[PDB]
Each structure stands twice: as structure tokens, then as C-alpha cells.
Nucleic acid binder design. Structure first.
Ligand SMILES: [Ca+2]
Ligand SMILES: [Ca+2]
Lengths: 492, 337, 506, 337
DNA sequence: CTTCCCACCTGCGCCACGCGAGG
DNA sequence: CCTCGCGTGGCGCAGGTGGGAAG
DNA sequence: TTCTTCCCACCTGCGCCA
DNA sequence: TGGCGCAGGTGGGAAGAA
DNA sequence: GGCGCAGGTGGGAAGA
DNA sequence: TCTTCCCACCTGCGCC
DNA sequence: CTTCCCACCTGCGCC
DNA sequence: GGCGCAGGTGGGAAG
């Protein structure tokens, strides 16, 4: 008959004692007045047997929480009915609801825990609370005094495939970076490398109070990834031989022409930095030194910090600036391929690549080529790029198989290079503005521009997924689908 | 004489429902090895006795010799699902004139339109010709019953007609080969694990025309039926012709814009078939029949690939030849039956 | 059948057909599949407390993304209060690990004519879950094979969101439930054979009984289907039909269902055996006769003494005979059928030999193939397959590991743990020590490890020794030595055979 | 046909690190065959010249012969990890008496307490004896360097000392046999896929003493090495003996209760050894050299099964004999080694 | 005469649904 | 006419018992 | 308004082997 | 000699074009 | 200011 | 002899 | 004072 | 006589 009234009174007396469950910690009122009452017959379709009215310190505050009492006679099936009844109370226009349930059941040991889990993981609402009570003592005037305990309170743009660079994300770079990471994880107490006396002097002159090694590697951190990057940079790319700015033979300064320890993709020789062309950071400095415009100390400072544009050109960059560009495009490539974790530790696939390279000839070997190509296709999501371009090309060439062709010598249509470039531009516009699966920013108004899909098409051509002939009259880009099929079941 | 290196499937015989019902019959009769016999009607046995004395009517009308498990499954499939007692009625004598009964088999058409017809689909069919001969008075009821199972020889040059025995032989020898090549039945005739998987899919998701059954059949054709090998052959021999010359079969009809026509399509298909059957020795081809019409080069493979989505419906392009859809072919290769 | 469980299957079939017709009911506009295939199925028996009326299984063009939509059918009989309960159990099924949950409520109620609109308004404003679909149905016509065809509309669609392992509602036995005489190998073989024969070409007409049996069923159960009463079935599922065709064809055959014999004017027992072989293989099993206190013998004795007539005997043959204080109430055909079906189907489902909907799986078909090829369920190959399945799919290997670990832990601290003095000073391992050791093992497994389930005791002279069926099966299959106990170890497991049967790749 | 039916291991030679570093050296040398030969000391080359007039200074300190990939990796491992330049110094005090340097190699020990160590650590060691006779003037510094490679004669009761060459031969044969029987290297010496898996887990999870390396070693000992067959044999024979009498070999105790004493354990193990040797013809046995001490029956096998967890630490019990733990054995028996 | 095993017998817990008393 | 209160269908799975058979 | 042309569901019957 | 395993024909709908 | 990834330019090679 | 085209080596740009 | 284990030692047969 | 593979022995820990 009249049993939920005692539970409602107990909850009302508890709410004032513990404002934390009724109100959030951000705006918890100092004083709250709580009373118990029964809903009017016109309140709504649900009966709303009892409700506790709570008010904050202010005069205009007013909230009502309709509570639901489920006796153990209902069983474990009353838990589900209680959840539904709480939702109806909120829909009727109440501020909140309370599910008062026994602490334990004959078959269910943790009813309140289950109800709270249901309300959290699925309902996603914070306006209904759960109160599990100990068995009451009918003799006492207030059987639920101290029996009710709270359980759950209530509250009253992206490229979409792996970023790779033509000259900075070679196979040997990945191999040696992973090897250095593994060796440094094996021996965390490895000693920091050393820099030349002239190099550290120039670094100090350029920037006072800066770490010579943290400066030449373009890092501001001490994490594991920073450490392995520093070791790789100062051991494989920026070797002591490479870091020699000039040669002082016979009184005339000439670039030493020293190469690094990272093999080129073609395998003809090793890679180079700051040397090899008519203009290079290690050759303009030598030319200036022979001319006499700068001193040897100024030469070291220019080598570390670069050379300004001097008008109408790209300002040449030194070791510090090139370090950031090299670092942030081999880190991002490995992260996107998921060959390293977030902390910077090689994964199972990174260890598999290292194992393939060590067991077989090297990074420039057939097994390593196959593994890297399959990783690019599957994990690098180059298959998505191939599917996109194939779909767009087919939908453009089905309407007209001579879409971009030009008249030939005798009038026979021919797929010239201008047609290829405008077709690629249309593909780029479709992939950027319409499909929105490529982040792209314009700028750099320069005498020369760069080919659309330069690195992607270069890598695809090198790995064999597209034909050596870069275009055809009908298909457009001649995708080799047998190779893609073979690479799509490698199961790395 | 090399054998064709993919599954032999026809267009109206080796459908998705025929396989399902044949496998169901085999599965049901595996648990009931002592199934007595199927039944005929007295006129049929009288006609069979008149034609071939001292021969079993059941094994004569089903065109079978032994009594093995697979022969038993065919006997219970022919006379119960295809040559049903309704189908085996040759005419409908109403108001003194005869006509085609209009009976359909119990096998679906593989497109959901209706059930498949047998021997009376259109004019000049077996039942229609028999009814016309009966109306004309050329033959009697006994001769009509004999012709319904023996067939009518060609009146002129033309082509002969097929009775129940010959059609049963063709259907049986083109369905058992297809089921054996897909590895859906064992050598003895018992269904394999993949046959049971197909059974379960069809019985659970609503028949052989459901999406799940279509996906399973397409994956089986690509992987077990070696249709992916055929697609690879076609694609590798096609890209070798449009790379040397992207205008191989232009047929310059319009004055300035060549267009890929149907004659060019048939020339390209003939070149592909010649390369497949002579240079590669993969296909098997037989001397043709001097007839007003001929079947196309790849009549059934091309339509099977077109229906399952592995080849575009337009079946035409100036530079690509046969447009294959490699997104669906790759997806169908990871089903792991 | 049950007026509620009969309509749930029809509603599930109609909802599956509707989802097939319009793939956008359960999917989104952006990710709309080309087409999907949907079927109706039921929750497995051993899966969680919250039990739904059924689930629609959806398979899209990926051929691997199989989903499940736990249904909740409601009837006008349970007033208007059932809407809140339906919402509650819908959230419960969502917590159970289901992608969707579809309320199947009626569209017309006495209070207000807009139940579905209210349900959506409650769901879309407070619940905030897009995986709860709402259907409103019209009064079906229960006189056609498709009563719900065209009378259900999807008022609110759903958007899809596993790991239903815990089911924290008390301890549950972790190995497969097997029995000594009811749940046997040949019963499994014949049940699977019936299921496979009924799946192909379904809708077999019916089983039939005798005129006297039908008259007795009507006399002691008016207005009930004789087949459903004599089989203790209240549904139209595929597995229910398989059980109906298996009970009245293999076990309760017409020869078996003959209660008495009127030779020389004195009632007797026909001496008729079933068609199911025994695990021994000596002779076919028996039902309701073969002992002094059996049901058929008791009925014949009552008839001979004149206590009851033929009509009362026929009624007692199917309704059983009560006990006048001393003894246990005798069991008729109906209750024994219930017991047999629930021992066999639970074991078949736990062994993963029949799917959730009822069709046999690949392992069930493999068992049928072995039995039919090698000459029955008592062949050596069938025995090996059954033992390996019991070890692997049934958690009998886990049971052996548990008991071995507990026994080793007990006997490492103190050998001669339970022994008693023998002829001289040499201790012996007598039967009392064996029973005490088994009781201690059971107490450890139940109270502490929470692996087994124990209910109560019947307070009868016999006691149902601790590991009765499990140890019997292990001894018969060879994983436990024939000598039941040993002084040093306790239960002498043979680990060579356990590891031989642990890797057969079935 | 006497031939032991399990992998041949030893307590201190075929350790986890002695395999990890050996395989690492093999992998490193396979990727660069053109590598400089290891460099010895100066007088160490002279002493060999005194010992042998034509032997190579590296092919003599390693007992190697001819030339092969296996010989090269063995020499590199021996001179880089075991016979390190620091270890190869016999006396390093030179103050008022020549003491023992206490040099430890780079090979960790199984218990992980400290690095391994040869020819030092106990009174009856090679270096301590040489230092003793060099402080007393019994030999010369050149004679001491010669004896450090040749080995002192008996000069005592029954046995001789071993130098560096003979110890190198013993270590080489032990490691080579334990690696070839485990199928961790090919016949030519190249590591297999299992060896590379071992190297990967050792390098990735913190050396050969980590939990992953221990688990892999136990798994490959149970599966690839026929230790499971040995465990099955001993368990079957123990159960066969104890079924007849569950109180076999026991002796009266304090209150008359039977007890499994050490003598009972030794005679039970001896009976097991006799059954495995002269009855099943599984083991291979030889003479005992007639020495005051004797190695126990199953010394290396039981030690490995005990420290890897397949046999309880308490080496015996009353009614079972050897308390084999079958949960761990079963768990390790299903592992892709 | 007593106790164990195995093929037979036997029904306890508990959820979910339905009908009805009280308000 | 809503809400529980109580009954029960059905379901799943766990608990007895007679006769051979050894001791 | 009528003549072709391709395509599937519905028809034939080589061609080798015992 | 016939059975076995595949291969090679036609007839009406839809279309496109004159 | 550091970090994600975009955007250039020499110089063989291959021809007009 | 002059024009492009690709690759390997080289440059900064929007954004907490 | 005695015994056992496990790192460090030591030769045994046989082609 | 070199290889594949068996056999001892000191010092700590526990009784
Ligand atoms: Ca209430
Ligand atoms: Ca319901």
C-alpha cells in the first residue's frame, strides 16, 4: 500500500546531507531544501507514485525527481521495467528520475551495477540515478535509514594515403631508422654522439645557450622518438664525413663531395646532401670563400644556418633547416604505415621488414621490394587512390573514349602530353574539390611548378603497378591490375 | 586436344537453383539410401515399351545405365523437379482439339520472373509440334506418345527434335560436370563441405536467388571455377593489343572520329579465342555445324561475368576492349569459401 | 502453441522480409548497401539473462558483416504498460552486445491511438540511441502461412552500432551437459539425421498417433493439440519440428507407445524396445518398462487388480501416476519427452553441432558422414570423433585440468591425504576416502572456483554420486583409467590419450 | 641401434645466451662474409708456436679445421663472447704474487645473477693452478702461457686439467649438436625461420632471460626436441610400476608410515634408466670412468624439465615418482615453434 | 549382505507473460 | 483504466534408483 | 512502320573411349 | 556397338536506324 | 616556435 | 641546338 | 657431518 | 685424429 513513501523520505533526507549526487561539482548549491510528495492525477500517463522536490539556495530554484520503487517480489524482470519507467518520467517533464532497487536479488547479485552499466554504455543520459538499498527493518519507523546507498548519481583536409617523398623516404632510410630504434631500445643507456669543435663553436655563435646536438637535429624534446631520430641523423645521414663543408687543398676551397651511408633507391651509389650540383650549400660557400666575401667562421655559420635568398630565388637552407624536413617526413611516413607505435617502438610489421632486410640482401632486394610495395598498397592505402583514379577515369572515358585527344598528322586522334596534363589536372580537381580526399594548398609563384601526383605516380611506376608508358589513349593512366592483385594478398 | 581450364556451365541448365535442388536431393537421399523408386504413368511406360522393349522405363526416360549414388540422385532430380508429372503431360485435349498444356518445371528461372519451361516454351517446340501433328491427323495418340519421348526427326534439312531421353542426357551430363568441376560433390556423389555451406545459405536466407547465394556462387566461380584465370588471360592478351596500337579495330565510320563497332568487337573476340585455343592451348574447340546461325565466341562466360558484375554491361570501349571491374573481382577473391 | 511465441516468429519473418525489401530501414542513406539478405533466428539457450523474442540476422554485400537485431514483440493483452518494459528490454539487448533492437509494438491501443509516435518521442528525446527501431503492427490474420504479410510498417528506422561472454548471473557449469542414458551417441546421430532430412524439403505433413492416445489426451487435456501435448512442445520453430519428428519416430514409436497386452485376459507388458541403440551396443534402449516399478508394469498391475479401467489406464500412460506420500511421482510420456528433449538439445547446442536457427553446422554434417560411412554411431571412427569433440568443444579438457590441478595441490602438501589403516600399518585408499576426496573437489569447484552449479538435494535415500556422468564418460572413452582410484594420485588420468584427442582438427 | 632420442644439452654450455649470441653472430656474418679475422694477443701467438710448429694461431685455439660458414661463425663467437681478450689474461696482479684476474665473459647466466666465467672461480681451476705454480717458481711465465693453452697433466689423483683448446672443442661440439638437433640452423650453418624467431623475440622483449625467450625455449624443447617423448616414456613407466603397488620403493618412517626417501628415488630412477636403455633401446650409455663421484641418472634432462616448469621443484613424491606438471606441458605443446 | 556402476527415471529454479485486485 | 501482485508455461539443466556384478 | 542485330532462356549432338 | 563429357545452335524480346 | 606534410629545381635522356 | 619529362636533391606554410 | 643441485669441467668411441 | 656426445666435480644451501 504505502511503502515507497518511506524510501522517498529517506532519499530526500539523504539528498540534503549529500548535495554531490543531486548537483554537479561545478555549481553545487550551499543549501538545498528537499520534500516528498505524490504527483497529481493529471501529471501524465505514467503514475509517478512519488517525487522528491529539491530547491537550491535561491528562491527561483525548483526541481522535481520522480522516484521508482521496485520491490524484490517483481524479480530481475522489474529492472528492465524500471529503466523504461524512468525514461517516461523524463518525457513527462520532470527534471530527473531515481531507480530505487534492492541491493541484491535471489538470482542477481549486482542489480545496481548492471543498471548503472546499462545507463552508461547505451542510454547516454545523466538525468536518472540509481539507488540500491539494503533490506529494510519493518519494525523501525524509518526502515531505510542508512540502508539506501548511492551507486550512480545524476546531473540535474587529409590526403587519405601514406605521405611519401621522392628523395627522403627511401627503403634504406626506413630500414636504418628501424634498426637504430631497435638497437636503442635494447640499450637505453647509449651515449650521445659528438660534434666537431668548429661545428659546436658555430652553433654557439649562431644561437647562444642552445644544445649543439639538439640544434643540429632540429629537435626540442627528450622522448624515445627524438632520441632515435638524433642517432639516425648523426650516424647515417649527417655523418662526420658528410658534415665537412669544404676541402682546403692547395689553398683553394672545394667541396669534399662526400656521400652518406644510405643507399639510393636505384642502387647506383649512396645518397648525398648539400653537394652534387652547380649550386649547393657546400659549393656556394666554397665559391664565396674563394671570392673572399665571407670568413671561415662565417662559412661554418652559413653552413649551419643556410644562406639568404639575396633576391629572386629560394633561400638556401643549412643543416638545421634540412634536418626538420628530413625528420618530419620519415616520422610521418612510418607512423602512417604503422611500422612504429605512438611512443616510437617498432611494431610486428616493422620488425618483419627489418627481418626481411637482414635475412636477405638488403632494402634494395626483391623480397624487400615486394614487402614495401605490398605495404604501400595495403597499409599505405594506395589501393584506395588507384580505385579512385580508375573509377573517375572510367566514368570520364565511357562517355567519350576520345575525351582529351587531339588531331594528329592525318587527323587520327592522338593522346599527346598536353592531354595527359589536363587529364591529370581534371583528376586532381575531382579528387580535391569533389571527393575531398586530398588536402592541398596553393602558392609559391615560381618559374617552375611540380607535376600533379608526382610522388604517387613515380612510386607506382617504379613498383610496377602502372606501365612504363605513362599514358594511353583509351584508359588514361595504364594501371597494371595483375600486379595489384598479386600485391593485395601478401598478408603482411 | 587440351581441356578447357575453367568450369563448364551453361545458360539455362546449370543455374543457381538447379544446383541447389540437385544438392538437396543428394543430401535427402543420403539419409534415406533405401528410397524405392520414382514413378511414371501408364501411357509413358507403354510408349517406352513400344520404342525399346525389355528396358527399364525409369532408366530409359532418365537416360541412365547403372544404379550408382549419383545416378540415383539424377533419377530423383529429373522426375521430381524438372520432369514433374505436370510437365510430362504432352497435350491438353479440350473440345476435340489438342494444345500445349502450358506446364512449367519447379526450378526458378535464375532471374525471379517465373519458373523455367521445358519442351513447350515457344512455338515450334516439341509439345507444339506434336499438338499440331495430332490436329492435322498425321499421327495418332500412340505415335504422339512415342514421339514425346523419342523426338521427331527433321522433315527437311533443318535440325532434329529432342525427346525426353535426349534432353535428360544433355541436362545430366552438363550439370554433373559443372558440379564436379566446382568440387561441390565427391567422386561417389556425396555433397562436400562447400556443398553443405551452399545448402545452408540457400535454406537460411531465402533460396538460391538471394543476395548471399549470388555472392557465394560468384566467389565459387571466381576461385574454384577458375574464372579469375580466364579474366587474367583476357586482360593480359587485351592490354597487349591496345598498347602496341590503341586503335586496333577502329573501323572509321564517322568522318574523323573512329568508333568501336560490333564488327570490330567480333573481330577482337575471334582474335582472343584463336590466341586462347591455339597459341595458349587452354580452351577446347570443336568443328562447327554448317548452320544459318552460330553461337558467339565466349557466349556463356561473358554473360556469366556480366550478370555477376565482373564485367561492365556496356561490353564495349575503344581502348580497353572488354571492361573488367577489378574492384568486384578483388572483393570476390577474399570470400574464403 | 503459445499465443505469444507463435506470433513472434511470424513478426520476425515479416521484419526480415521488410528489411530485405528496403535496405534503408536498418542502414543509413550515406552507407546504403546495394542489397541485403535477412533471415529470422533465435537467441542461443546459454546466452545471458535478457532473452529476446527473436533476432533478425542481416548479411550485406560484404558476405561477412553478419549482424543481429534483437526483437521485442508486444501484444495488446499486456495493456499499455508494456511500452516502458519494451524500451527497457531493448536497452538490455543493446547492452547484451547486439547491433540493433527492434520493438514490434501494436499500432492500436485503447488508451491512445499513437503508441509508436510516443515510443519514438521518448527514444529520440531521452534515449538518444539510433539503434532502436520501432514498428507498429495491425491485428494479424492468424489463418494464413504469412499472417503478418503487409500489416507491419517501420515507424522508426535503426542505425547499426559482440563480446556477450560475461552473463554475470551466478555460476554456470563450464562443460557440456551430458547424461548417461538419454543424451547418447545414437540419439545424436538420429536427431541430426532427422534435422537434415527435414531441412531439405521442409513442411512434411505431420506425425500421427493412435485413436486411443488422442482420446486420452483430449480427456485429460481439452482443447490441445495431441502431438504438441505428447511431445511437450509449444512452438513452430525448425528445431521444434525436428524434435517432434524424432520423438514419435525413433523413441516413442507406435510399438513403444503400446502400453499393455491383453493375452489370456490378463494385462501384461509388450516388451517393445525403441529404435535407438545403446552405448553398449548389446540391444536397443527401453522406455517406460523393464523393471518392477516402471510405468507400464504399474499400469498393468492397476488394471489387473481392477483399481482402474482402460480409459484411466490410457490417461495415466501419458499423464503419469502420482505417489501417495511414499515414493516419487511416476512420469508419463509428456514429462519424459520434455526431459529427453531438454537433455538432448542442450547438449547438441553446447557442442555446436546445430546452429542457433536449428540447421546443423559443418561439424554435425561431418559426424553424420562418419556415422553413415563407417556403419553407425557405435563404430570406432564415430567413437573417436565423439571423444575428441567432448574433449575440445565440450570443456572436458578444462574439467580434467581443474581436477588435476586441485588434486596435485592437495596431494603435494600431504600424500596419504585420505588413506585409512589397512590390514597392518600400510594405508589403503578405500572407497570412503575416494568419496571424501570427490566431495572436497566438488566443494572447491563450486564454492571457490565458481565453475560448477549446484542447486539443492532431493532428500532421498540415494545421493547421485558427485561426478557421475562425467567420470563415466571419461572412463568409457579412455581418458581416465578403468581402476577408478589410486592411492598416490586419486583419479588416474591418461594424458597420452588426452593430448592425442586434443589435436584432431575437427 | 643405440642413439638418444632427444636433444643433447648441457648445464652450463648450451644456455639461452650461448644460442642467442651465436645466432646473432651468424646473422651478422652472413650479411658480410668479408670481415677481418679476430686478433689474439702477442705471446698467445708465441705460445702456440711453442706448442705447435705449424698450426695456425686461430685454428689451434678453437680446435677448428678446414673452412666453412659454421667454422667462421664459431670462431667469431668463441673469440668475441666466450674467449674474450679480457678473459684470455691468465694472471693480472703482477704486484708481489700472481693472482686470478676474475675476468667474466659477455655471456649471461640462466639465473641472471652474473655473467658466465671459465677457468676461474674455484680452487681447482686452470688459472688458479697456473698462478699457484708460477708464484712458487714451479714454472716460467712462458711455460705458464704455454700451459694456459695446452693444459696441465694429471699431477694428482685421477684426472687432468683442460686448457683453452680442448675446452673450446667441448663447447663447440655441445653448442653445435644442441643447435643442429633443435633444427635452429641449416646444414650449411644459416639460421632457419625458427632461429630468426628466437632472435627476434630475444632482441625485442629484453634478451634471452626474458619471459618470452624462456617460453619459446621451453616450447621448442618440448616440441622440436623430443622431450615430450621422454616425459611420456617416464610417466607411462612410472604409472605402470605404481599401479601394481602405490607404495613401491617406500621405507618405514618415524611412526611406521611409509616415506619416499632419497635412496628410493635413486633406485626408482635407476630402474627407469635401465628400462629406457636396455629394454626400449632409446638411450645411449657408456662407461663411468671409475671416479669417486658419479653424475646422477637424468642430470641434464631433469634439471631442464625442473627449471623450465615441466616438473615440480620437489623432485619426487610418494605414489607418482616424478611429479610432472601436465597443465604447462599441454599448454606448451600447442605452440607454433 | 553390502556397495558401485550404468541405464533408466524425476523434477527444482527462474524468467517472462498474462489475468486480475486496488486505486 | 494504470500498476503491480500473483499465478503459471516452458525451459534449462541438475538430481534419484533398480538390477547386475563383485567382494 | 519495318528491317537488322545482340542476348539469354531454351535447344541439339559431336567425338572419343571400352 | 553405346554411354560419357562436354561442345555448338535458334527464337522471341528490346534496342537502334532507315 | 615546433610540427604535420605541402611545394620546388639541377641535370641526364630523349628527342623536336 | 632547343624542348620537355622524370627523378634525386631541396624549401617553407598554415596552425596552438 | 652428510647429501643434492647446478654451474663449471673432462674425456670416450669411432670411423 | 676430428667429430658427436657422453661422463665427472667443487661450493652453496638445507637438513
Ligand atoms: Ca512502484
Ligand atoms: Ca514479448
Amino acid at each position: 500500500n504505502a511503502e515507497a513513501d518511506f524510501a522517498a523520505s529517506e532519499v530526500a533526507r539523504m539528498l540534503v546531507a549529500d548535495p554531490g549526487l543531486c548537483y554537479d561539482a561545478a555549481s553545487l548549491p550551499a543549501s538545498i531544501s528537499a520534500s516528498a510528495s505524490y504527483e497529481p492525477s493529471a501529471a501524465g500517463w505514467p503514475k509517478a507514485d512519488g517525487l522528491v522536490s529539491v530547491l537550491e539556495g535561491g528562491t527561483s530554484t525548483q526541481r522535481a525527481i520522480a522516484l521508482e520503487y521496485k520491490r524484490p517480489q517483481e524479480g530481475i524482470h522489474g529492472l528492465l521495467t524500471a529503466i523504461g519507467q524512468a525514461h517516461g518520467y523524463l518525457h513527462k517533464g520532470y527534471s530527473g528520475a531515481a531507480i530505487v532497487i534492492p541491493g541484491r536479488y535471489s538470482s542477481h547479485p549486482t542489480p545496481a551495477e548492471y543498471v548503472r552499466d546499462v545507463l552508461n554504455a547505451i542510454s547516454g543520459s545523466r538525468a536518472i540515478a540509481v539507488f540500491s538499498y539494503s533490506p529494510p527493518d519493518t519494525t523501525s519507523p524509518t526502515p531505510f535509514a542508512g540502508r539506501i546507498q548511492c551507486v550512480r548519481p545524476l546531473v540535474f583536409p587529409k590526403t587519405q594515403w601514406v605521405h611519401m617523398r621522392e628523395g627522403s623516404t627511401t627503403r634504406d632510410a626506413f630500414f636504418r631508422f628501424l634498426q637504430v630504434a631497435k638497437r636503442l631500445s635494447a640499450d637505453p643507456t647509449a651515449p650521445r654522439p659528438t660534434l666537431r669543435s668548429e661545428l659546436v663553436a658555430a652553433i654557439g655563435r649562431l644561437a647562444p645557450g642552445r644544445d649543439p646536438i639538439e640544434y643540429i637535429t632540429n629537435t626540442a624534446d627528450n622522448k624515445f622518438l627524438t632520441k632515435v631520430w638524433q642517432f639516425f641523423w648523426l650516424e647515417w645521414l649527417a655523418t662526420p664525413a658528410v658534415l665537412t663543408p669544404w676541402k682546403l687543398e692547395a689553398g683553394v676551397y672545394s667541396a669534399p663531395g662526400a656521400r652518406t651511408r644510405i643507399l639510393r633507391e636505384d642502387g647506383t651509389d649512396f645518397s648525398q646532401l648539400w653537394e652534387g650540383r652547380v649550386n649547393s650549400l657546400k659549393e656556394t660557400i666554397a665559391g664565396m670563400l674563394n671570392r673572399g666575401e665571407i670568413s671561415e667562421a662565417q662559412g661554418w655559420e652559413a653552413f649551419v644556418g643556410g644562406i639568404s635568398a639575396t633576391g629572386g630565388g629560394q633561400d638556401k637552407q643549412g643543416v638545421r633547416a634540412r634536418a626538420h624536413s628530413y625528420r618530419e617526413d620519415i616520422d610521418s611516413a612510418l607512423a602512417q604505415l604503422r611500422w612504429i607505435e605512438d611512443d616510437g617502438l617498432p611494431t610486428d610489421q616493422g620488425y618483419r621488414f627489418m627481418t626481411i632486410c637482414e635475412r636477405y640482401g638488403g632494402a634494395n632486394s626483391r623480397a624487400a621490394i615486394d614487402y614495401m610495395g605490398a605495404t604501400l598498397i595495403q597499409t599505405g592505402r594506395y589501393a584506395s587512390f588507384l580505385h579512385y583514379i580508375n573509377r573517375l577515369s572510367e566514368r570520364k572515358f565511357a562517355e567519350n573514349p576520345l575525351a582529351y585527344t587531339k588531331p594528329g598528322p592525318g587527323g587520327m586522334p592522338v593522346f599527346t602530353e598536353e592531354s595527359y596534363w589536363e587529364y591529370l589536372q581534371d583528376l586532381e580537381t575531382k579528387l580535391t574539390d569533389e571527393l575531398r580526399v586530398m588536402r592541398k594548398v596553393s602558392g609559391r609563384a615560381r618559374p617552375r611548378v611540380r607535376t600533379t601526383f608526382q610522388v604517387e605516380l613515380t612510386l607506382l611506376r617504379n613498383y610496377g603497378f602502372v606501365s612504363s608508358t605513362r599514358h594511353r589513349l583509351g584508359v588514361g593512366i595504364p594501371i597494371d591490375w595483375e600486379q595489384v592483385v598479386q600485391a593485395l594478398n601478401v598478408d603482411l | 586436344g587440351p581441356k578447357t581450364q575453367w568450369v563448364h556451365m551453361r545458360e539455362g541448365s546449370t543455374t543457381r537453383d538447379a544446383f541447389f535442388r540437385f544438392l538437396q536431393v543428394a543430401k535427402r537421399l543420403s539419409a534415406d539410401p533405401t528410397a524405392p523408386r520414382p514413378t511414371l504413368r501408364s501411357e509413358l511406360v507403354a510408349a517406352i515399351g513400344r520404342l525399346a522393349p525389355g528396358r527399364d522405363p525409369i532408366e530409359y526416360i532418365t537416360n541412365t545405365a547403372d544404379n550408382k549414388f549419383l545416378t540415383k540422385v539424377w533419377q530423383f532430380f529429373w522426375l521430381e523437379w524438372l520432369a514433374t508429372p505436370a510437365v510430362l503431360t504432352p497435350w491438353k485435349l479440350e473440345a476435340g482439339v489438342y494444345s500445349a498444356p502450358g506446364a512449367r518445371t519447379r526450378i526458378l528461372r535464375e532471374d525471379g520472373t517465373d519458373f523455367s519451361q521445358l519442351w513447350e516454351g515457344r512455338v515450334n517446340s516439341l509439345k507444339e509440334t506434336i499438338a499440331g501433328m495430332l490436329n492435322r491427323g498425321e499421327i495418332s495418340e500412340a505415335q504422339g506418345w512415342e514421339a514425346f519421348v523419342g523426338g521427331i526427326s527433321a522433315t527437311g534439312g533443318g535440325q532434329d527434335k529432342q525427346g525426353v531421353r535426349a534432353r535428360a542426357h544433355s541436362y545430366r551430363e552438363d550439370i554433373d560436370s559443372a558440379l564436379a568441376q566446382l568440387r561441390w560433390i565427391e567422386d561417389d556423389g556425396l555433397p562436400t563441405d562447400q556443398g553443405y555451406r551452399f545448402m545452408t545459405i540457400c535454406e537460411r536466407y531465402g533460396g538460391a536467388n538471394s543476395r548471399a547465394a549470388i555472392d557465394y556462387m560468384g566467389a565459387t566461380l571466381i576461385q574454384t571455377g577458375r574464372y579469375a584465370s580466364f579474366l587474367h588471360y583476357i586482360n593480359r592478351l587485351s592490354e597487349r593489343k591496345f598498347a602496341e596500337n590503341p586503335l586496333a579495330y577502329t573501323k572509321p565510320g564517322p568522318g574523323g572520329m573512329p568508333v568501336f563497332t560490333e564488327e570490330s568487337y567480333w573481330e577482337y573476340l575471334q582474335d582472343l579465342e584463336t590466341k586462347l585455343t591455339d597459341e595458349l592451348r587452354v580452351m577446347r574447340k570443336v568443328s562447327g555445324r554448317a548452320r544459318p546461325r552460330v553461337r558467339t565466341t565466349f557466349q556463356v562466360e561473358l554473360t556469366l561475368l556480366r550478370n555477376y558484375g565482373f564485367v561492365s554491361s556496356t561490353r564495349h570501349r575503344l581502348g580497353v576492349g572488354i571492361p573488367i571491374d577489378w574492384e568486384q573481382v578483388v572483393q570476390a577473391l577474399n570470400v574464403d569459401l
